Amino acid sequence: EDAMTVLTPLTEKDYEGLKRVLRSLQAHKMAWPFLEPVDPNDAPDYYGVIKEPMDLATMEERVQRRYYEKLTEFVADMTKIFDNCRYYNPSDSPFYQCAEVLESFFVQKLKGFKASRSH
């Protein structure tokens, strides 16, 4: 990550961009597994093996409350969603596939956000 991403405080304008990025991911056809916290009734061992769970609704709450101070912190929460999924599930599961697709989409949108900050 470059110096702007790590060190430039998030402004109000930056927060309008983060809201738009998050809404784009929530609207993606392959986002369904990640919209809300993992349901322990459907995976009874999940919370014993994933120590820091994350989901898009938790990220939306954090965005609304201005939790994030730097872009790197927002990217770290998003990345946790995908990394938790690829560690818990095998490489041939549909959950793993959704993580592959949605992370690629996130990177496309994140590059767009970074470009608009600087020009």
Ligand X SMILES: CC(=O)NCCc1c[nH]c2ccc(F)cc12
**Residue ranges that bind ligand X, judged by CB under 6 A:** 33-34, 38-39, 42-43, 46, 85, 88-89, 95
CB of 34 to ligand X, least distance (A): 6
Q: How far is the CB of 50 from ligand X (least distance, A)?
A: 8
Distance of CA 22 to the CA centre of its chain: 8
Task: Between 71 and 102, name the residue whose CB sits nearer to ligand X.
Answer: 102
Beta carbon nearer to ligand X, 15 or 95: 95
Task: Tell me the backbone φ, ψ of residue 92, rounded to 5 degrees.
Answer: -90, 5
Q: Nearer to ligand X by C-beta: 95 or 105?
A: 95
H helices of the chain, in order, are 3-7, 12-26, 46-49, 56-64, 71-88, 94-118
We find the least distance from the C-beta atom of residue 94 to ligand X, in angstroms, to be 10
